[model samples]
Target: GILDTLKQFAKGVGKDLVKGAAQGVLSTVSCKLAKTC
Candidate 1:
């Protein structure tokens, strides 16, 4: 039971990391465009 729980938790963390990274890159690009304009 503990192993199953741990596996689920790891997957959640993986999703969060991907989401956060995508947002970070997108925001940075938007910021640069704003500065250029």
Candidate 2:
């Protein structure tokens, strides 16, 4: 969901950082969840 949405949004703005940041945030959340659970 997020990756697809990032791909679409990046294409419109011509900025990869937007997707990178989104991915980074998602990754961080996963890491936190992993630590807790």
Candidate 3:
């Protein structure tokens, strides 16, 4: 899924930042696509 991919990608950069990045992505996706998509 998207979360897993993000986590994997973050691992190479900084595993600790994954949670924040994932949350940001989730928020963006929800706000942008929740009604339109």
Best by lDDT: 1
* lDDT of model 2 at position 4: 98
Off by over 4 Å in 2: 15-37
Q: Single out the weakest 10-residue window by summed lDDT for candidate 3.
A: 28-37
Which wins on TM-score, candidate 1 or candidate 2?
A: 1
**What lDDT does candidate 3 reach at residue 5?**
96
* Clash tally for model 3: 0
What ranges in model 3 sit over 4 Å off? 15-37
Off by over 4 Å in 1: 26-37
TM-score of each: 0.49, 0.33, 0.34
Encode model 1's per-residue lDDT on 1-37: one tens digit a residue. Answer: 9999999989889888776556657565576565441
Q: Between which residue pairs do clashes occur in model 2?
A: none
Error of 1 at 34 (Å): 19
Can you rank all candidates by lDDT, best first? 1, 2, 3
Query: What lDDT would each prediction earn against the true structure?
Result: 0.70, 0.64, 0.63
What overall lDDT, based on C-alpha atoms, would model 2 receive against the true structure? Answer: 0.64
User: What is the alpha-carbon lDDT for the whole of candidate 3?
Assistant: 0.63
lDDT of 2 by residue, 1-37 (tens): 9999988877867656565446557565566665441
